[PDB]
Amino acid sequence: GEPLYTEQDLAVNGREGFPNYRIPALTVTPDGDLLASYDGRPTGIDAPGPNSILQRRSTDGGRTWGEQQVVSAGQTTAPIKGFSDPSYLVDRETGTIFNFHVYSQRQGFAGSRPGTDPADPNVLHANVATSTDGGLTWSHRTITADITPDPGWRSRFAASGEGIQLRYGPHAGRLIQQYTIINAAGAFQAVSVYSDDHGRTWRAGEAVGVGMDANKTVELSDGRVLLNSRDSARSGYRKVAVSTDGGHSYGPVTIDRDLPDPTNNASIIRAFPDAPAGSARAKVLLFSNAASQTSRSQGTIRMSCDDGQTWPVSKVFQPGSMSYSTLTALPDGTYGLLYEPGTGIRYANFNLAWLGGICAPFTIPDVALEPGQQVTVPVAVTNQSGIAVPKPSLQLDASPDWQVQGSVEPLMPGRQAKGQVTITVPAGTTPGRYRVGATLRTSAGNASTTFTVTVGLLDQARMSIADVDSEETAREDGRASNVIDGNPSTFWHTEWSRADAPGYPHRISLDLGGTHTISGLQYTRRQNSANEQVADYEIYTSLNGTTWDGPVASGRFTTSLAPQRAVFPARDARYIRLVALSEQTGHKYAAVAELEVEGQR
Ligand SMILES: OC[C@H]1O[C@@H](O)[C@H](O)[C@@H](O)[C@H]1O
Ligand code: NA
């Protein structure tokens, strides 16, 4: 029915006993009682500040809230004791409550020394409070010696927010809390901690990932576990993985470019946690996070109705500052959102009608073309809503001076719809990749997708590296072929891990896959570091890749994060070469996120 958003603080900084409140946690009890947990920070810092774990209770479904009670009390007189980064987990089968948090002594996450004795003051401990009675009374234990089977795992902390219980498959019942660890080589890794015995005993799964951090899991309509992680390598995105063995082990980790993230915690839940395995409702996920690649702001809810493959629906809940957010499914059928507005801990409620979407994701393929050209690309709407909509329309958001229109057949339940998008790119459009937004506008909700229209660039897929002067592959992935992989988040980086690596000049040559009329090169700097930016440069081209004609163009790049063009009289060529002559502030290394070649396909 009617859209609903509502919002109210639970904690403000310098009020009710602490000068700082952070790190939100939120669950629903087998009663329907809502529990909000969070850091009370005397000295305003994460571990090892002598922090407390706090909690409040709503016995009327999120309208009103009881006293600010202490679950875990920090010791601020020496020996100091810190308890921080809270995360709930309900076992709805026994109905027991867990609340995981760190127990820190002298050392934070950074300086945690290997070992697992509770008494050791240089270990950051894994703690879990236990409550068998709805979260009123609490028992306390230290589980580090159970979840460190690799001795070089020198550090750990449970991902703040809320954890899961598997409802399906051979592992049904299993409780799963996510951790981040530090291994011997000091890489940040993701790992599930689980219990097959309702909390009695806990163990660690197989560590997966590099550049990981605070991360969450959700069980999909088929019982697979989706991991969704914070990227500590600062990609601008969420990292993702999947387990087919109930959180023991995950497959390859990828950057999820559907999911821009500023290096912040995020949350991912089942919208319908009790639905049968395999059902339409069992594929529904809500995702909350800072929807900006660069700042903790524009908090955004996304809805997936296809196990998180596609994310058709999104809506901003907070324009301004928004750090950690966590979601929880309410018994009333609405949703709890506990986030960080900046003044402490806020509690928000929304319903699915607020989100304002239609479960009907659509695909419109990427298209390549020269300027002057007209092209029809099809639309395929996968109507997952199961409802009739007489007259849907397609709004497109393309460049100001393009000729664009969208169209979509009537929307029918259970069956797909067809649509079309015609595009004319006028003569004189700047060569580039154009991200065009498409919106499906309908009576019962909107869905939207993006697709790229490449204008006068050559196909990267046909390209290869012909030569590179220098590349780092030992201590990080700085392969030259990264300039032609599509991903501004992966880069070429000249060797750095050895001291005798060359400085400038640097060189990278592309083989174009064939001979093409070419007229320019677009350079994209490395996005997450500023000391390997190319300044002075020359460009060369070749037909046979050994006789080089040039410099055909020359100049100096800016510190602009966007693609920058270097243009030259059109000419046939099978190869193009970039010579980086200098760095922006004089440094040894070059990094390049992307090279595109302006030319005729
Ligand atoms: O030695 C310089 C290196 O510094 C590292 O910290 C960085 O991750 C590398 O990309 C490289 O720039
Ligand atoms: Na790249």
Side-chain angles (χ1 to χ4, degrees):
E2 204 82 4
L4 164 99
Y5 193 91
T6 198
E7 191 169 269
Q8 79 217 203
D9 266 77
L10 297 172
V12 172
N13 293 332
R15 290 169 179 173
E16 308 306 342
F18 295 85
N20 169 263
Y21 294 93
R22 282 209 56 183
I23 319 292
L26 193 87
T27 199
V28 164
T29 73
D31 262 56
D33 287 8
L34 282 63
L35 307 179
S37 193
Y38 46 78
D39 286 9
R41 276 168 191 204
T43 63
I45 67 203
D46 296 68
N51 300 339
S52 305
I53 305 302
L54 302 194
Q55 182 191 278
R56 296 178 69 153
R57 188 169 329 215
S58 190
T59 64
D60 75 349
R63 257 59 50 76
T64 51
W65 301 80
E67 62 183 60
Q68 183 170 249
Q69 291 181 355
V70 186
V71 170
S72 305
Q75 198 182 9
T76 142
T77 40
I80 267 86
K81 292 182 197 319
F83 302 98
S84 65
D85 285 359
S87 168
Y88 289 111
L89 209 162
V90 185
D91 189 334
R92 319 202 169 267
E93 294 199 351
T94 60
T96 324
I97 319 280
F98 298 97
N99 165 318
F100 282 89
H101 43 273
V102 313
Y103 167 37
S104 77
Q105 284 178 63
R106 284 178 92 245
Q107 305 294 340
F109 188 60
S112 172
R113 229 150 276 196
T116 71
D117 188 56
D120 183 357
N122 294 298
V123 171
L124 183 78
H125 284 284
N127 261 41
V128 49
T130 284
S131 165
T132 51
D133 73 350
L136 296 164
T137 61
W138 294 84
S139 39
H140 294 75
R141 67 195 274 215
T142 296
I143 50 144
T144 318
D146 311 315
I147 70 168
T148 324
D150 193 320
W153 284 7
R154 73 160 176 72
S155 183
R156 78 253 78 231
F157 86 107
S160 73
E162 179 185 20
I164 73 190
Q165 192 180 23
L166 297 184
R167 321 249 115 92
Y168 311 148
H171 304 303
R174 185 172 283 189
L175 312 165
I176 328 174
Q177 177 57 60
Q178 289 314 105
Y179 290 67
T180 309
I181 74 97
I182 297 180
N183 60 35
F188 283 21
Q189 296 208 289
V191 62
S192 285
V193 157
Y194 46 98
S195 187
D196 298 338
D197 62 354
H198 306 310
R200 300 169 260 176
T201 59
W202 295 91
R203 72 153 277 174
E206 304 192 328
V208 64
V210 285
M212 311 304 285
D213 203 296
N215 57 270
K216 305 286 155 75
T217 44
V218 55
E219 153 187 60
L220 313 172
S221 82
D222 68 334
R224 268 182 317 132
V225 190
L226 187 54
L227 193 142
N228 180 300
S229 192
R230 151 161 181 169
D231 197 2
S232 73
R234 326 207 147 245
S235 66
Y237 304 99
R238 309 285 308 161
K239 273 187 198 152
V240 304
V242 62
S243 186
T244 57
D245 54 1
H248 178 67
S249 76
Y250 298 86
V253 189
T254 45
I255 266 97
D256 191 359
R257 299 196 308 282
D258 309 323
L259 298 176
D261 197 82
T263 315
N264 201 23
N265 207 338
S267 84
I268 192 172
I269 60 161
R270 294 275 287 269
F272 312 99
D274 297 317
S279 68
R281 304 183 88 91
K283 316 197 157 159
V284 198
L285 306 183
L286 309 161
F287 177 74
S288 73
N289 97 320
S292 171
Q293 309 221 264
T294 63
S295 64
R296 281 162 187 211
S297 61
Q298 332 168 18
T300 295
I301 311 294
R302 313 187 186 276
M303 183 165 74
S304 182
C305 330
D306 61 6
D307 282 329
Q309 274 192 299
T310 69
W311 298 95
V313 189
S314 80
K315 203 169 154 86
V316 181
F317 75 80
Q318 189 41 248
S321 161
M322 204 298 299
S323 307
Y324 286 26
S325 58
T326 191
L327 292 158
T328 210
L330 299 191
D332 67 348
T334 67
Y335 300 87
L337 183 54
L338 199 66
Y339 68 112
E340 296 186 314
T343 52
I345 304 283
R346 186 147 314 166
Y347 173 81
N349 192 44
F350 67 94
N351 60 348
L352 284 177
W354 171 73
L355 214 52
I358 191 162
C359 275
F362 61 101
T363 56
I364 303 172
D366 297 343
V367 88
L369 61 158
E370 300 294 309
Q373 306 204 291
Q374 307 181 17
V375 68
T376 282
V377 16
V379 185
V381 187
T382 323
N383 188 30
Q384 307 175 313
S385 77
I387 59 181
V389 185
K391 278 263 170 71
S393 65
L394 198 50
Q395 211 217 305
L396 290 134
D397 180 53
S399 290
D401 19 51
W402 291 24
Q403 217 101 343
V404 203
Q405 64 251 36
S407 160
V408 53
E409 297 266 302
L411 288 190
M412 311 170 180
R415 295 292 278 272
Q416 282 198 332
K418 222 275 305 301
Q420 65 147 134
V421 169
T422 324
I423 291 150
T424 300
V425 175
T429 303
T430 303
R433 325 199 70 93
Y434 291 77
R435 160 147 298 174
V436 173
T439 300
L440 190 45
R441 303 207 101 93
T442 111
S443 42
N446 293 31
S448 81
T449 202
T450 68
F451 72 111
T452 303
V453 169
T454 304
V455 190
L457 302 177
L458 297 187
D459 180 15
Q460 289 195 307
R462 305 194 66 190
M463 296 171 187
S464 49
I465 297 308
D467 61 68
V468 75
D469 88 285
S470 186
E471 54 177 31
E472 185 64 46
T473 70
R475 290 266 293 272
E476 79 171 340
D477 181 15
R479 300 185 300 182
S481 58
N482 285 348
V483 305
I484 38 164
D485 76 352
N487 206 326
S489 313
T490 73
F491 46 81
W492 166 47
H493 201 308
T494 58
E495 190 187 37
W496 61 266
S497 73
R498 282 170 72 110
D500 64 18
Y504 286 81
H506 298 293
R507 186 200 78 255
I508 185 160
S509 313
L510 314 181
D511 179 355
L512 296 179
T515 319
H516 284 101
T517 302
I518 61 172
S519 50
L521 186 59
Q522 315 199 347
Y523 152 91
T524 299
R525 57 164 279 205
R526 164 180 192 193
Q527 304 285 112
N528 68 346
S529 165
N531 286 346
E532 315 84 38
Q533 289 184 76
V534 176
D536 292 350
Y537 72 86
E538 334 182 310
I539 297 160
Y540 294 77
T541 75
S542 184
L543 296 136
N544 60 3
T546 62
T547 311
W548 290 92
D549 309 311
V552 298
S554 91
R556 187 199 196 75
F557 294 127
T558 41
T559 52
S560 174
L561 290 156
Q564 311 178 48
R565 313 176 53 199
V567 303
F568 48 83
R571 60 198 292 126
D572 297 11
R574 168 147 196 177
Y575 305 86
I576 181 156
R577 175 177 281 180
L578 170 69
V579 174
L581 297 168
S582 56
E583 201 276 320
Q584 288 291 338
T585 59
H587 288 90
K588 212 185 169 170
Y589 311 127
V592 176
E594 275 292 318
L595 296 185
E596 302 272 13
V597 182
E598 305 178 16
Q600 155 164 335
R601 282 189 188 215

PDB file of all heavy atoms in Angstrom, residues 476 491 493 496-497 526 529 532 589, ligand 1:
ATOM      1  N   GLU A 476      51.754  -7.207  -6.055  1.00  0.00           N
ATOM      2  CA  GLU A 476      50.395  -6.811  -6.391  1.00  0.00           C
ATOM      3  C   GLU A 476      50.155  -7.036  -7.869  1.00  0.00           C
ATOM      4  O   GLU A 476      51.081  -7.250  -8.628  1.00  0.00           O
ATOM      5  CB  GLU A 476      50.116  -5.351  -6.016  1.00  0.00           C
ATOM      6  CG  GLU A 476      50.676  -4.375  -7.002  1.00  0.00           C
ATOM      7  CD  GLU A 476      50.229  -2.954  -6.768  1.00  0.00           C
ATOM      8  OE1 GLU A 476      49.202  -2.710  -6.095  1.00  0.00           O
ATOM      9  OE2 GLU A 476      50.933  -2.077  -7.282  1.00  0.00           O
ATOM     10  N   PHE A 491      44.817  -1.707 -12.593  1.00  0.00           N
ATOM     11  CA  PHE A 491      45.731  -0.806 -13.262  1.00  0.00           C
ATOM     12  C   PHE A 491      46.992  -1.563 -13.628  1.00  0.00           C
ATOM     13  O   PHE A 491      47.312  -2.616 -13.033  1.00  0.00           O
ATOM     14  CB  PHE A 491      46.047   0.412 -12.359  1.00  0.00           C
ATOM     15  CG  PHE A 491      46.376   0.041 -10.949  1.00  0.00           C
ATOM     16  CD1 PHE A 491      47.654  -0.407 -10.601  1.00  0.00           C
ATOM     17  CD2 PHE A 491      45.398   0.123  -9.956  1.00  0.00           C
ATOM     18  CE1 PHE A 491      47.949  -0.763  -9.277  1.00  0.00           C
ATOM     19  CE2 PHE A 491      45.684  -0.246  -8.641  1.00  0.00           C
ATOM     20  CZ  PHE A 491      46.960  -0.688  -8.303  1.00  0.00           C
ATOM     21  N   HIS A 493      50.966  -1.085 -13.321  1.00  0.00           N
ATOM     22  CA  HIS A 493      51.899  -0.419 -12.411  1.00  0.00           C
ATOM     23  C   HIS A 493      53.280  -0.935 -12.766  1.00  0.00           C
ATOM     24  O   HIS A 493      53.492  -2.147 -12.838  1.00  0.00           O
ATOM     25  CB  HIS A 493      51.585  -0.779 -10.959  1.00  0.00           C
ATOM     26  CG  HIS A 493      52.128   0.192  -9.950  1.00  0.00           C
ATOM     27  ND1 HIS A 493      53.453   0.585  -9.921  1.00  0.00           N
ATOM     28  CD2 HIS A 493      51.525   0.830  -8.917  1.00  0.00           C
ATOM     29  CE1 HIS A 493      53.641   1.415  -8.912  1.00  0.00           C
ATOM     30  NE2 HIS A 493      52.489   1.587  -8.290  1.00  0.00           N
ATOM     31  N   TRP A 496      57.717  -2.158  -8.764  1.00  0.00           N
ATOM     32  CA  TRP A 496      58.147  -1.374  -7.607  1.00  0.00           C
ATOM     33  C   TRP A 496      58.752  -2.245  -6.514  1.00  0.00           C
ATOM     34  O   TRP A 496      59.623  -1.795  -5.781  1.00  0.00           O
ATOM     35  CB  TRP A 496      57.001  -0.503  -7.078  1.00  0.00           C
ATOM     36  CG  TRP A 496      55.784  -1.268  -6.612  1.00  0.00           C
ATOM     37  CD1 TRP A 496      54.665  -1.558  -7.347  1.00  0.00           C
ATOM     38  CD2 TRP A 496      55.563  -1.820  -5.304  1.00  0.00           C
ATOM     39  NE1 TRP A 496      53.769  -2.260  -6.581  1.00  0.00           N
ATOM     40  CE2 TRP A 496      54.293  -2.434  -5.322  1.00  0.00           C
ATOM     41  CE3 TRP A 496      56.322  -1.860  -4.118  1.00  0.00           C
ATOM     42  CZ2 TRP A 496      53.764  -3.093  -4.201  1.00  0.00           C
ATOM     43  CZ3 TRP A 496      55.792  -2.506  -3.003  1.00  0.00           C
ATOM     44  CH2 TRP A 496      54.525  -3.106  -3.051  1.00  0.00           C
ATOM     45  N   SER A 497      58.304  -3.490  -6.413  1.00  0.00           N
ATOM     46  CA  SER A 497      58.736  -4.390  -5.342  1.00  0.00           C
ATOM     47  C   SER A 497      60.254  -4.662  -5.222  1.00  0.00           C
ATOM     48  O   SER A 497      60.700  -5.072  -4.169  1.00  0.00           O
ATOM     49  CB  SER A 497      57.944  -5.704  -5.372  1.00  0.00           C
ATOM     50  OG  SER A 497      58.333  -6.544  -6.452  1.00  0.00           O
ATOM     51  N   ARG A 526      45.478   5.939 -12.475  1.00  0.00           N
ATOM     52  CA  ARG A 526      45.112   5.081 -11.332  1.00  0.00           C
ATOM     53  C   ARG A 526      44.258   5.904 -10.332  1.00  0.00           C
ATOM     54  O   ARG A 526      44.618   7.048  -9.986  1.00  0.00           O
ATOM     55  CB  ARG A 526      46.369   4.488 -10.696  1.00  0.00           C
ATOM     56  CG  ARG A 526      46.172   3.916  -9.315  1.00  0.00           C
ATOM     57  CD  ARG A 526      47.456   3.364  -8.779  1.00  0.00           C
ATOM     58  NE  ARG A 526      47.201   2.574  -7.584  1.00  0.00           N
ATOM     59  CZ  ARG A 526      48.137   2.147  -6.739  1.00  0.00           C
ATOM     60  NH1 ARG A 526      49.422   2.464  -6.925  1.00  0.00           N
ATOM     61  NH2 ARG A 526      47.772   1.383  -5.712  1.00  0.00           N
ATOM     62  N   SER A 529      45.375   6.114  -5.877  1.00  0.00           N
ATOM     63  CA  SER A 529      46.712   6.601  -5.510  1.00  0.00           C
ATOM     64  C   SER A 529      47.147   7.711  -6.445  1.00  0.00           C
ATOM     65  O   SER A 529      46.800   7.698  -7.617  1.00  0.00           O
ATOM     66  CB  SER A 529      47.723   5.461  -5.561  1.00  0.00           C
ATOM     67  OG  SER A 529      49.047   5.977  -5.561  1.00  0.00           O
ATOM     68  N   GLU A 532      51.763   8.111  -8.866  1.00  0.00           N
ATOM     69  CA  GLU A 532      52.234   7.339 -10.021  1.00  0.00           C
ATOM     70  C   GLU A 532      51.506   7.813 -11.267  1.00  0.00           C
ATOM     71  O   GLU A 532      51.274   7.051 -12.218  1.00  0.00           O
ATOM     72  CB  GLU A 532      52.009   5.815  -9.857  1.00  0.00           C
ATOM     73  CG  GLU A 532      52.373   5.175  -8.520  1.00  0.00           C
ATOM     74  CD  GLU A 532      51.265   5.307  -7.497  1.00  0.00           C
ATOM     75  OE1 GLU A 532      50.077   5.202  -7.887  1.00  0.00           O
ATOM     76  OE2 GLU A 532      51.578   5.521  -6.309  1.00  0.00           O
ATOM     77  N   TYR A 589      57.439   5.710 -10.448  1.00  0.00           N
ATOM     78  CA  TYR A 589      56.521   4.734 -11.041  1.00  0.00           C
ATOM     79  C   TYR A 589      55.413   5.290 -11.912  1.00  0.00           C
ATOM     80  O   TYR A 589      54.943   6.421 -11.700  1.00  0.00           O
ATOM     81  CB  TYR A 589      55.884   3.904  -9.927  1.00  0.00           C
ATOM     82  CG  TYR A 589      56.880   3.356  -8.940  1.00  0.00           C
ATOM     83  CD1 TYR A 589      56.712   3.566  -7.584  1.00  0.00           C
ATOM     84  CD2 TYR A 589      57.981   2.598  -9.368  1.00  0.00           C
ATOM     85  CE1 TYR A 589      57.621   3.075  -6.655  1.00  0.00           C
ATOM     86  CE2 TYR A 589      58.919   2.101  -8.438  1.00  0.00           C
ATOM     87  CZ  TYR A 589      58.728   2.351  -7.080  1.00  0.00           C
ATOM     88  OH  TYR A 589      59.618   1.879  -6.144  1.00  0.00           O
TER      89      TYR A 589
HETATM   90  O1  LIG B   1      56.632   1.545  -3.524  1.00  0.00           O
HETATM   91  C1  LIG B   1      55.451   2.178  -3.963  1.00  0.00           C
HETATM   92  C2  LIG B   1      54.257   1.258  -3.730  1.00  0.00           C
HETATM   93  O2  LIG B   1      53.612   1.647  -2.532  1.00  0.00           O
HETATM   94  C3  LIG B   1      52.632   0.709  -2.118  1.00  0.00           C
HETATM   95  O3  LIG B   1      52.209   1.044  -0.810  1.00  0.00           O
HETATM   96  C4  LIG B   1      51.476   0.712  -3.137  1.00  0.00           C
HETATM   97  O4  LIG B   1      50.477  -0.231  -2.808  1.00  0.00           O
HETATM   98  C5  LIG B   1      52.000   0.410  -4.548  1.00  0.00           C
HETATM   99  O5  LIG B   1      50.974   0.618  -5.496  1.00  0.00           O
HETATM  100  C6  LIG B   1      53.257   1.227  -4.901  1.00  0.00           C
HETATM  101  O6  LIG B   1      52.914   2.534  -5.315  1.00  0.00           O
END
